[PDB]
Design a protein around this ligand. Structure first.
Ligand SMILES: [Ca+2]
Ligand code: NA
Ligand code: NA
Length: 320
DNA sequence: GCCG
DNA sequence: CGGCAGTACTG
DNA sequence: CAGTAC
């Protein structure tokens, strides 16, 4: 908040390292960004920055240069390919490997991608709604989208439960996308409902394009009826009710929150996933699962916190 | 990039 | 030194 | 499987 003059410089280097394939170095920048945004005072000393968790010796040296000289010399040495890679990676379905290949092939704009680049089915859809997918909708519009899916699902089974997660359930004023989670408390009526639910949403012209049509999760594009409506990202994950709490917790977010929770689960001999919070998960020296462990009963989100020795945090308190 |  | 979340999904 | 996104 009060250190935005330091976080904005590191944020450019974080996107540059991310789009260039250095995902782990970009992870250290992202956690240093979140630590600076939540710190209590504008940093003014080298020892003050090193004492912060998530900021080591190198990150504190970069904080020192921003205060003393007002610039980061590495920002003057960012590869000219980075802005072009950010343009390509924003295409949904196109990541760092695809963006780097397109820049290697000589492409510099989305016009080069439209006319000359080899596109997958998902990349062509993400490009078709390039401007629409970069916009965060008001949470009012996200409510209309969740009610559209919920009415179609409950039309065949009124006992179905539909909860919108992501940034929406965290209480954010705007939402990047809509994460609709569907389940049924009887543990069985959720079977084979994807074919009937998505067909009902297509008959009314609500679904415009389809990105992923899997057994459990569905990713796609939708647009509310009427004028002035943008194409918004829509997700529909259907889970068994025995896995509803872990799925609700993962899909509510945020992404970093899940990564700190699942890391803490590993430090306690447990394994947290969008399916279940297993305990006694066996592993080797590489932190790789060799024993499946046993699913712990988690009927609510509070049970996942309790089994992890954590006090419960509301969805609005899960941004870090 | 950070951390144990 | 070496992990850094786990998994569904798609070709 | 690599790549991508959840
Ligand atoms: Ca979101
Ligand atoms: Na430290
Ligand atoms: Na993308």
């Amino acid at each position: 908040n009060h250190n935005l003059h330091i976080t904005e410089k590191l944020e450019v280097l974080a996107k540059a390292y991310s789009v260039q394939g250095d995902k782990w170095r970009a992870l250290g920048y992202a956690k240093a960004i979140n630590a600076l945004k939540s710190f209590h005072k504008p940093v003014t000393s080298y020892q003050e920055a090193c004492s912060i968790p998530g900021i080591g010796k190198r990150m504190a040296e970069k904080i020192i240069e921003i205060l003393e000289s007002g610039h980061l010399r590495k920002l003057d040495h960012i590869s000219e390919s980075v802005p072009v890679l950010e343009l390509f990676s924003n295409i949904w379905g196109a990541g760092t490997k695809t963006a780097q290949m397109w820049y290697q092939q000589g492409f510099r704009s989305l016009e080069d991608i439209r006319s000359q680049a080899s596109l997958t089915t998902q990349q062509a859809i993400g490009l078709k709604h390039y401007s629409d997918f970069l916009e965060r909708m008001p949470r009012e519009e996200a409510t209309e989208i969740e009610q559209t899916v919920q009415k179609a699902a409950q039309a065949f089974n009124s006992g179905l439960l539909c909860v919108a997660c992501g940034s929406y359930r965290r209480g954010k004023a705007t939402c990047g996308d809509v994460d609709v989670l569907i389940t049924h408390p009887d543990g069985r009526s959720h079977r084979g409902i994807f074919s009937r639910l998505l067909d009902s949403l297509r008959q009314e012209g609500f679904l415009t394009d389809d990105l992923v049509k899997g057994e459990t999760k569905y990713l796609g594009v939708c647009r509310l009826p009427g004028p002035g409506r943008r194409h918004r990202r829509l997700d529909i994950k259907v889970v068994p009710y025995s896995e509803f709490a872990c799925a609700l917790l993962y899909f509510t977010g945020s992404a970093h929150f899940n990564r700190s929770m699942r890391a803490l689960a590993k430090t306690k001999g447990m394994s947290l996933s969008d399916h279940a919070l297993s305990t006694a998960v066996v592993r080797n020296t590489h932190g790789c699962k060799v024993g499946p462990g046993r699913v712990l009963p988690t009927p609510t989100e509070k049970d996942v916190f309790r089994l992890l020795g954590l006090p419960y945090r509301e969805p609005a308190e899960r941004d870090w």
